[PDB]
């Protein structure tokens, strides 16, 4: 049974990480403030995939295979305040300065200083695994820690461990120096991550305002959407059962990534019903599947249907009221999708529902409209770089002017890859 380690970097990363781990504890029946279970009981499911056991069953504990890194200490302090004795205190690493929204600080400056400690915690977590099946890196790329040190650590991870799958889950800024940091991070995510799942803050914002009626959505609201999707994607790895289709990170990325140069993914979730009504109001399978494949449901500001699908996985979990109907529906979708490069259409099923929906679905797709999201970013970068807006910020920090041109070109090489895949 495969083990996964989740590394979270920076504000967004760690706040999402905290929400993810709380949800996963609740799914497995593990006390989210203490890592304990009721007297005599073991957690549900394949808990050892994401947790390790400490000591005897009496005073012992179930410990997230988690490492949290930041430069600014506020967010990790908050985790300590809200999460009791859940985490290994040695795995929550912070310093003192923030990176001040500067990618170069995280990659070359203060970031290089934190790396030996972070890498040493990775060593320890890795070795205490029966069989390590992947590492998930949770981060935003608009700031300077998640982007810079996220870039630094993925690179580092791949050099030292090589064969271990590394998936980035990366939050993108919504239309400051954010376009610069995004582009710089993208290079590493293109060259070194085995795959990168984007979470477009612009889309998340809209969904929270639109589908949920939140006039002024907060990051907590946006994190709910991400957490559901993360819980749902990881459910294949965290449960077993008579009907449960077990799927490793390895198997998943293999099916989602047809070439190393096309490894950027997007995702959609259903139901996007407001938490306000969550268990009282349910969608039937029809409306649910319909919604899953709707342009208004993707965690990306773009329209997958106007582009082409390179690959697709539908990850279902929970109650299955009518399997002939769901199969008929998915078969119909499979014949309706705009296609490229030969496609894959994978279907996963997990018996165990999440904690908020009786049944839910995550759609992961490798689709060419990701080019639109990426294009939006590059247009903003170019708008600032054409006039060298905050350029000295990065120049005085170790990057050279010509080398950032290389990274703007590197990202362009990735945007052209997906445009070529479409036509």
């Amino acid at each position: 049974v495969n083990n996964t380690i989740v590394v979270s970097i920076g504000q967004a990363g760690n706040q999402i990480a905290a929400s993810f781990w709380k949800t996963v504890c609740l799914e497995h029946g593990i006390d989210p403030l203490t890592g304990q279970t009721a007297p005599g009981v073991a957690p549900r499911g394949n808990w050892s995939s994401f947790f390790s056991k400490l000591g005897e069953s009496s005073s012992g504990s179930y410990v997230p295979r988690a490492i949290m890194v930041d430069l600014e200490p506020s967010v990790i302090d908050n985790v300590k305040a809200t999460s009791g004795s859940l985490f290994n205190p040695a795995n929550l690493i912070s310093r003192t300065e923030g990176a001040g929204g500067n990618f170069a600080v995280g990659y070359l400056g203060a970031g290089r200083e934190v790396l030996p400690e972070v890498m040493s915690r990775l060593d320890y977590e890795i070795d205490k695994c029966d069989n390590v099946g992947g590492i998930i890196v949770l981060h935003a790329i608009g700031g300077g820690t998640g982007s810079g040190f996220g870039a630094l650590l993925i690179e580092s991870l791949k050099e030292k461990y090589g064969e271990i799958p590394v998936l980035s889950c990366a939050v993108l800024p919504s239309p400051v120096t954010e376009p610069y940091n995004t582009v710089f991070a993208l290079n590493t995510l293109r060259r070194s991550a085995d795959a990168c799942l984007i979470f477009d803050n612009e889309a998340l914002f809209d969904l929270a305002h639109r589908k949920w009626n939140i006039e002024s959505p907060t990051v907590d609201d946006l994190n709910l959407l991400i957490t559901e999707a993360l819980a749902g994607i990881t459910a294949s790895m965290r449960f077993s059962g008579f009907l449960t289709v077990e799927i490793s990170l390895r198997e998943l990325l293999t099916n989602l990534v047809p070439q190393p140069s096309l490894h950027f993914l997007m995702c959609a979730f259903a139901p996007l019903t407001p938490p306000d009504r969550s268990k009282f109001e349910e969608l039937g399978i029809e409306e649910m599947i319909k919604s899953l494949f709707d342009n208004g449901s993707v965690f990306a500001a773009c329209s997958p249907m106007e582009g082409r699908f390179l690959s697709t996985a539908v990850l279902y979990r929970g109650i299955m009221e009518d399997k002939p109907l769901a199969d008929a529906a998915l078969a119909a979708m499979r014949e309706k999708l705009p296609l490229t490069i030969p496609t894959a259409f994978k279907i996963g099923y997990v018996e165990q529902p999440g904690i908020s929906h009786r049944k839910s679905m995550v759609l992961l797709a490798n689709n060419t409209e990701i080019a639109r999201v990426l294009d939006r970013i590059c247009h903003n970068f170019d708008k600032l770089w054409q006039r060298k807006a905050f350029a000295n910020w990065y120049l005085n920090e170790g990057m050279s002017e010509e080398q950032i041109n290389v990274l703007r070109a590197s990202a362009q090489e990735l945007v052209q890859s997906y445009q070529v895949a479409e036509e």
């Binding site: 005599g40 009981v41 073991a42 499911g45 005897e56 069953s57 077993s240 008579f242």
Partner: protein, 103 residues
């Protein structure tokens, strides 16, 4: 098939090396008889990996109350002198395995 008393529990279960599954049971319990033939199969297929023990709560009333047993049959998994997991009630030979596989 390992039978236990209250006197033998300490050595047989708690001081034991390796994992051990204890079936708290009685003759007047319908569901307990249901799994008696099931428990024999596991005693074969988990050789070395597990030892399977039985404690009849009528003739040994002292042990179950110490472990917060709510009824019978109750399967308790011990590793050292510690309860790893708990299964209450009669079950399939397959659900029992998935329970043993994970812990």
């Amino acid at each position: 098939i390992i039978h236990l008393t209250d006197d033998s529990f300490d050595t047989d279960v708690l001081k034991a090396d390796g994992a051990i599954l204890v079936d708290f049971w009685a003759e007047w319990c319908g569901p307990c008889k249901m799994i008696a033939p099931i428990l024999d199969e596991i005693a074969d297929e988990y050789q070395g990996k597990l030892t399977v023990a039985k404690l009849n709560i009528d003739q040994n009333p002292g042990t179950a109350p110490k472990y917060g047993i709510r009824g019978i049959p109750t399967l308790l998994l011990f590793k050292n002198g510690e309860v790893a997991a708990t299964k209450v009630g009669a079950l399939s030979k397959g659900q029992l395995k998935e329970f043993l596989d994970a812990n």
